[PDB]
Amino acid sequence: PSTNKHLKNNFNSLHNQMRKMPVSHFKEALDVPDYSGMRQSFAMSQGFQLNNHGYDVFIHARRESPQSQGKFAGDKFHISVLRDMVPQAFQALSGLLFSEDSPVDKWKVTDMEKVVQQARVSLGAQFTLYIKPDQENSQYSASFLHKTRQFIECLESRLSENGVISGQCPESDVHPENWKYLSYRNELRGEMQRQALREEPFYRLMTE
8 A cells, every 4th residue: 555556556547647638837936036046045935945054965945835745755856957057957947946836845956055065976966856646645646647747847848948958867867768857766766776767657657
């Protein structure tokens, strides 16, 4: 009994219901900080609590959305861009990342200054997007999965429309041919571990 079991058992059902749903739209937000402002935040932007603590290399963003009642199943995404274009990528994505319609309640961005201070290799994953089922019982609803897939793809093209240079996907992640910045990983689960992810029902529902 688990989130992944419900997925395996409704695998085709979720896939068919999802492809039949109309494009979902996200009202992007404008009253948002730009990267430099984020580097220097404790503050709050449209529901998301912003935190930068030093024992980290990230600036965290978390919204206490009282709807996502499910429990974390380890599903998350990364966004990889050339280290130098983090500020350009962040600005481009800010409208969505802070959107009231975004399905992602918790995410983080690499803080370039702390990346230098802590001599951290920044070739990829400057952004991390956390995801968990919407249903109190921890099962992903087809409507939620669809919105999440639409969201991720909205991220993808917003980045390429802005000519953002692709980064290097973390070796512990997987991604389709059509994902130039986005990659997937499930932390609750070598290139053996990568094919494991590739057959993950959640990942396949975001890809095929």
